[PDB]
């Protein structure tokens, strides 16, 4: 309902960085329905492939404009255009892996443009990520509230691994709008349900197709205090 | 649908421990509708009151039998009777407070009986908890999966504070059944939505009434992979 965010939008991304020292670069292009909360991206590893670590640890770093907003929840991301927004995140893994990201989101000639700078370290050589024994993420519920002149999110995610168990992680995200705070409506406390899925891959994950469904919502449960 | 867990059940609790060294003891009694996911408890501070820290940090330690289970999710807790279950948890606060709990849940003469041993430390003297500037929890979504011969949960919660912002925390819980694993159905990966609310208080929180609504569920979002 921002005139610049159409019911169908394209996006492209460049990701550069390293994991455990292993330098790489990826590019991607995709499209989605921003108001329906759906999107698809086709990603290529263009430098350093095939990568010696699980592509799953990169998956959350490739698109916040495509969240369906329900109930009365203002859309931090769609309201930000044309100025756009940034996000920064630190993910911590249960077996010691760490992944840090700085992301810029812009709009140019009608297409969303993403740059992600990423740094991963301390993934154990014996672990599912460096042995490529990982098998995709579960859905998850992000918890958000305004903080520090931006929007803070907190996430906890479970990564399936070979044999049938899970590797957990958590992250904190700080989302920042390039539009001045006086010129958009800030949301309050809310949730975003996510379901990040891999649809296709080839060539030892040198090509990956990912999809996300995402919906901003309140907790569905009734309240004894008349609270959202 | 365990014959020992009736549609209305009573419970009683004893909590003993300390926070920042401050010893205390609480007792409580309540009742609820286990299959509806609702419960109410009336709690008294019987030693050490009035407490010099926010009662809100004790709130999650006072009842897992009262979760409404949807879809196909076996109920770890209701299946455990008559043997019962335990839980252990470590909560970590964003301003450094830490709270550790060991809990036993039994059934005696038709009433649920809880014992919670709690230890809290490193709450800052300047913080909302020790200045009693806290104003109740937001709802939250716990993420669970079987692990270590038990059920693991991961939670992240936001505590309202005076002035309008939040103090965040996270915790990991290990739930263990006293019934042998061969004799009940273990759930898979799932979520529990919670809404823990304070309804009444008196006497500088020497008396507190709390309510919880809790529902076990899958993520509501559609999947491109035919997954729950």
What are the residue boundaries of the structural domains of chain A, listed by start?
Answer: 1-228
Beta-carbon separation of A168 and B156 below 8 A: no
B156, B213, B215 ranked by CB distance to A154: nearest: B156
- What is the number of residues in chain B? 228
- Residues paired with residue B13 on neighbouring β-strands, in sequence order: B28, B114
Give me the residue label for tokens 């809790």: B214
Which residue, A90, A85, A86, A158, is CA-closest to A118?
A90
Query: Nearest-CA residue of chain B relative to A216?
Result: B221
Tokens representing A24?
A: 């790489």
Contact with chain A for residue B215, Cβ under 8 A: yes
Q: Does A164 touch chain B (CB under 8 A)?
A: no
Point out the residue among A141, A168, A224 whose CB comes nearest to the CB of B197: A224
What residue spans of A32-160 are helical by DSSP H? none
Q: Is the minimum CB–CB distance between B190 and chain A shorter than 8 Å?
A: no
CB-CB contact of A46 with A26 (8 Å): yes
State whether A219 and B193 contact (CB < 8 Å).
yes
A219 CA to chain B: closest CA distance, Å? 7
Q: How far is B219 from chain A (nearest CA, A)?
A: 7
Calpha distance A190→A73 (Å, rounded)? 8
Q: E strands, B96-149, where?
A: 98-108, 111-121, 134-137, 140-147
User: In degrees rounded to 5, what are phi and psi of residue A117?
Assistant: -105, 120
Residue position matching structure tokens 């550790």: B100
Structure tokens at A34: 């921003």
Helix, coil or strand: residue B180: coil
Q: In chain B, which residues are last before a break of more than 2.5 Å from C to the next N?
A: 62
The CA–CA distances, whole Å, from A113 to A99, A202, B181 equal 22, 24, 51
Q: Cα–Cα distance between A102 and A27 in angstroms, integer? A: 16
- Determine how β-strand B9-19 pairs with β-strand B111-121: parallel
Q: How far is residue A67's CA from residue A153's CA, in Å, rounded to a whole number? A: 14
Evaluate whether B171 touches B92 at the Cβ level (below 8 Å): yes
Indicate the residue of A147, A197, A219 with minimum beta-carbon distance to B195: A219
Chain centre to alpha carbon of residue B70: 19
Cα(A19)–Cα(A58) distance, integer angstroms: 10
Residue of B39, B71, B142, B224 to mutate when probing chain A, most A C-beta within 10 A: B224
- Cis, bond preceding A50 (omega within 30 deg of 0): yes
Q: Is residue A20 left, alpha or beta, with left meaning phi > 0 and alpha meaning psi from -120 to 50?
A: left
> Which residues of chain A have a CB within 8 Å of the CB of B193?
219-221
How many angstroms separate the CA atoms of B205 and A203, rounded? 62
Two structure tokens written together for A156? 């906890």
B165:A156 CB<8 A: no
What is the torsion angle, in degrees rounded to the nearest 10, for the CA atoms of residue B64, residue B67, residue B73 and residue B76? Answer: 20
Report the DSSP pairing between strands A22-33 and A38-47.
antiparallel
Q: Quote the CA–CA distance of B217 and B193 in Å, as a whole number.
A: 8
The answer to whether the Cβ–Cβ distance between B158 and A189 falls below 8 Å is yes
* Alpha carbon distance, N-terminus to C-terminus of chain A: 24
What Rg do the C-alpha atoms of chain B give, in angstroms? 17
Chain A residues lying within 8 Å of B222, measured CB to CB: 195, 213
Strands (E), chain B: 9-19, 22-33, 38-47, 68-69, 85-93, 98-108, 111-121, 134-137, 140-147, 150-161, 166-177, 190-202, 207-217
| 3-state helix/strand/coil string of A44-61 | EEEECCCCCCCHHHHHHH
* Breaks in chain A after residues, C-to-N cutoff 2.5 Å: 62
- Token pair for B202: 């008196």
Residue A76 φ/ψ region, left for φ over 0, alpha for ψ in the -120 to 50 degree band, beta for the rest: alpha
Q: What are phi and psi of A193, to 5 degrees?
A: -80, 135
Helix ranges, chain B (H): none
A102 vs A98: CA distance, rounded Å: 14
- Return the number of other C-beta atoms located less than 10 Å from residue A181's C-beta: 11
Residue A33 sits at the vertex; the CA angle it makes with A185 and B223, to the nearest 5 degrees, is: 110
How far is CA A114 from its chain centroid?
11
- A153 cis-preceded (ω within 30 degrees of 0): no
**How crowded is residue B7: how many other Cβ atoms within 10 Å of its Cβ?**
8
Element (H, E) at A43: strand A38-47
**Beta-bridge partners for B87:** B103, B175
Count of CB contacts below 8 A, A vs B?
91
With tokens 């290990």, the residue in question is: B174
Residue in the structure block whose two tokens are 């309050």: A188
| CA proximity to A137, closest of A62, A29, A26 | A62
CA pair distance A153, B111, nearest whole angstrom: 40
Q: Does B219 touch chain A (CB under 8 A)?
A: yes
What is the greatest pairwise CA distance in chain A?
55
By C-alpha distance, which of A57, A66, A45, A46 is closest to A201? A45
SS3 B203: coil
- Structure token digits, residue A19: 């994991």
Q: How far is CA B61 from CA A166, B43, B51, B175, in A?
A: 26, 12, 16, 13
Q: By the 8 A CB rule, do A27 and A46 touch?
A: yes
With tokens 């990423």, the residue in question is A118
CATH 2.40.155.10 fits B1-228, yes or no: yes
How many angstroms separate the CA atoms of B149 and B181, rounded? Answer: 8
Contact B213 A195 (CB under 8 A): no
**CA nearest B224: which of A31, A192, A139, A167?**
A139
Chain B interface, best mutation among A94, A141, A153, A161, by max B CB count within 10 A: A141
Q: Which 8-state DSSP code applies to residue A219?
A: -
CA dihedral of A96, A102, A103, A104, whole degrees rounded to 10: 180
Q: How far is CA B80 from CA A115, B72, B106, B184, in A?
A: 50, 17, 10, 8
CB distance A200 to A210 below 8 Å: no
User: CA-CA distance, B45 to A225, in Å (whole number)?
Assistant: 23
CA-based nearest distance B109→chain A, Å: 30
Rg (CA), chain A: 17
A141, A165, A225: residue with CB nearest B147: A165
Q: How far apart are CA A92 and CA B6, in angstroms?
A: 42
Strands B134-137 and B111-121: unpaired
Nearest CA in chain A to B154: A156
């Amino acid at each position: 309902m921002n005139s610049l965010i159409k019911e169908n939008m394209r996006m492209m991304v460049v990701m550069e960085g390293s994991v455990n020292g292993y330098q790489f670069k990826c590019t991607g292009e995709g499209d989605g329905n921003p108001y329906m909360g759906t999107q698809t991206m086709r990603i290529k590893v263009v430098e350093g492939g095939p990568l010696p670590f699980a592509f799953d640890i990169l998956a959350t770093s490739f698109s916040k404009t495509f969240i369906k907003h329900t109930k009365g929840i203002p859309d931090f991301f769609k309201q930000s255009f044309p100025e756009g927004f940034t996000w920064e995140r630190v993910t911590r893994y249960e077996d010691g892996g760490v992944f840090t990201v700085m992301q810029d989101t812009s709009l140019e000639d009608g297409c969303l443009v993403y740059h992600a700078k990423v740094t991963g370290t301390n993934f154990p050589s014996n672990g599912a990520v460096m042995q490529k024994k990982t098998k995709g993420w579960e859905p998850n519920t992000e918890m958000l509230y305004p903080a520090d002149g931006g929007l803070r999110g907190y996430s906890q995610m479970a990564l399936n691994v070979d044999g049938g168990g899970y590797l957990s992680c958590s992250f904190e995200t700080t989302y920042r709008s390039k539009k001045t705070v006086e010129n958009f409506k800030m949301p309050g406390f809310h949730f975003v349900d996510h379901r990040l899925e891999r649809l296709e891959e080839s060539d030892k994950e040198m090509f990956v197709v990912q999809h996300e469904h995402a919906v901003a919502k309140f907790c569905d449960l009734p309240s004894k205090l008349g609270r959202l």
